Design an enzyme around this catalytic site. Structure first.
Site, PDB file in Angstrom:
ATOM      1  N   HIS A  41     -59.741 -33.495  80.408  1.00  0.00           N
ATOM      2  CA  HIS A  41     -61.015 -33.043  79.859  1.00  0.00           C
ATOM      3  C   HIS A  41     -60.839 -32.237  78.580  1.00  0.00           C
ATOM      4  CE1 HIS A  41     -60.435 -29.259  82.425  1.00  0.00           C
ATOM      5  NE2 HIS A  41     -60.685 -28.768  81.224  1.00  0.00           N
ATOM      6  N   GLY A 143     -60.288 -21.455  79.127  1.00  0.00           N
ATOM      7  CA  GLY A 143     -59.044 -21.676  78.427  1.00  0.00           C
ATOM      8  C   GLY A 143     -57.801 -21.527  79.272  1.00  0.00           C
ATOM      9  N   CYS A 145     -57.326 -23.588  81.846  1.00  0.00           N
ATOM     10  CA  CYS A 145     -57.069 -24.951  82.304  1.00  0.00           C
ATOM     11  C   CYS A 145     -55.739 -25.436  81.748  1.00  0.00           C
ATOM     12  CB  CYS A 145     -58.201 -25.894  81.895  1.00  0.00           C
ATOM     13  SG  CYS A 145     -59.794 -25.203  82.403  1.00  0.00           S
TER      14      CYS A 145
END
Lengths: 305, 305
Positions: A41, A143, A145
């Site tokens: 993503h 952030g 991830c």
């Protein structure tokens, strides 16, 4: 003596963390050999996340759309491919700091260390457990991830988790390193149901064994119980049922303390029915289930890496 | 979101840990530049620890009595000296992995990360606080002595603790890196009294602020209180009194949540008098005091290193 929620040393992993940017999304990636792993993503905008078509979105991106940054050293993407929910960015340079590693898919109730990162830089390390509903209760800000979970055995880093999303309920969901989600979740911004979060009974028992080792024994009683009778009470308090496999795993703790597994089950049974009366066990007023039997043995024997 | 007891990444410190052996005692040392730091009781036998004369014992040792081992790389001691309770082993090789570091003596109530080691090898990392009685509640087995505590700020490792001894009560005592003990303890195997262990009030307040940030607000009330009136109740429950310096430090948390420090004090006051009624705050049934206001800000803003 003493007992702490202890994480693995994170050094071997710190040197594998990189910042991946695609368009205006920047998150963390895992740089091993000449490959970078990151959540797919990264290629989405905020609008895209509501209902992404990842195949369509990935075709409008080329190798030079991805900015991989390791410290002040830019890597060059010479190949990209989607494996399930992770993007594999083939780069020109193999990470000289690549450890002996493997990818493993863990089962619920197992513990691992999380290296929380932001912009490819380590921020902190903590220990957590994979809940029975395949979520984790971590600490993640936007952030984060791409942050990874891992175990260390001797010299080998076992990567088992990559963080992808926070659910509207505040719990966390992610994949193994092959891109397959733990649990029924998907990487899209929609309401997703997590199941009942039950208590990891076998881990509670290991923790109670750790307590006896460290001098907390007020909760012991000479009652005993049967595996069936215990499970009847455990089921009512949303405790995972106990199996013979769990009994076997606890054998070494049973031998070191002289306390049979079924006797310890009887002590836990009482705690569920009568509570802790405001007392504590190992500094906690709640029953702890984020220590596996292996964790307890590891911390009460002194294992290094 | 979420909130975890988070340790600093330990990579920069892992590469500084070495095994020091003198005679038949082996413990951990800290290798920075061309110097190795370790507890001076490495030179003692089991019998010696009852009543050691360290000056007399150190004179019957020469440079070649100390075996420093960094992985499979032996270092050569070309100078040794005792500074307070630490031994400084001057070696021929400067550690190429030496980080930007400094030595700092912390105050009670401050937190730091501990890298537990055995035979010079990392075993695990956890976060703890210096108690008001200058002990720590760690997890240490024999041979962990020499393990160090540390903070990281940007690129600089602040070493603040070296583990020396376990007290008969199961708590842990150690020195700063200049060899000065935290608290009134001495490195000798005798009964030593630790003082009353009070609760770090300012840290509890920061943790309650973290709770409000993460959605736990059931404990809030519209009562208020005075600093004097709060301290009267805090004193009775063995809570450290609160000062204006503590109020100032919490200002940034007050501003982000819209909740005045004195209002939050009133909510804590109620919790001490009426308990938690079996409820929880951030997954805990007890009031947590191992997060400084800086820790909370750090974890709720996303700081990297």
């Amino acid at each position: 003596s003493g007992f702490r929620k202890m994480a693995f040393p994170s050094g071997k992993v710190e040197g594998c963390m990189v910042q991946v940017t695609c368009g205006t999304t920047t998150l963390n990636g895992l740089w091993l050999d000449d490959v970078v792993y990151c959540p797919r993503h990264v290629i989405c905008t905020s609008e895209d996340m509501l209902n992404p078509n990842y195949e369509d979105l990935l075709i409008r991106k080329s190798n030079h759309n991805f900015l991989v940054q390791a410290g002040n050293v830019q890597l060059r993407v010479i190949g990209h491919s989607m494996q399930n929910c992770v993007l594999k960015l083939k780069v020109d340079t193999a990470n000289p700091k690549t450890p002996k590693y493997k990818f493993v898919r863990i089962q619920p109730g197992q513990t691992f260390s999380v290296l929380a990162c932001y912009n490819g830089s380590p921020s902190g390390v903590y220990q957590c457990a994979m809940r029975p509903n395949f979520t984790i209760k971590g600490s993640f800000l936007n952030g984060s991830c791409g942050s990874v979970g891992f175990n260390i055995d001797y010299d080998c880093v076992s990567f088992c988790y990559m963080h992808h999303m926070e659910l509207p309920t505040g719990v966390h969901a992610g994949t193994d390193l092959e891109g397959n989600f733990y649990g029924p979740f998907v990487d899209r911004q929609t309401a997703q149901a997590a199941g009942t979060d039950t208590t990891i009974t076998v881990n509670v028992l290991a923790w109670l064994y750790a307590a006896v080792i460290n001098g907390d024994r007020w909760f012991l009683n000479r009652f005993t119980t049967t595996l069936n009778d215990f499970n009847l009470v455990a089921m009512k308090y949303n405790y995972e049922p106990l199996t013979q496999d769990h009994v076997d795993i606890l054998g070494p703790l049973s031998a070191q303390t002289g306390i049979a597994v079924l006797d310890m089950c009887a002590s836990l049974k009482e705690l569920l029915q009568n509570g802790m009366n405001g007392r504590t066990i190992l500094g906690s007023a709640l029953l702890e289930d984020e220590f596996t039997p292996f964790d307890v043995v590891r911390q009460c024997s002194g294992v290094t890496f």
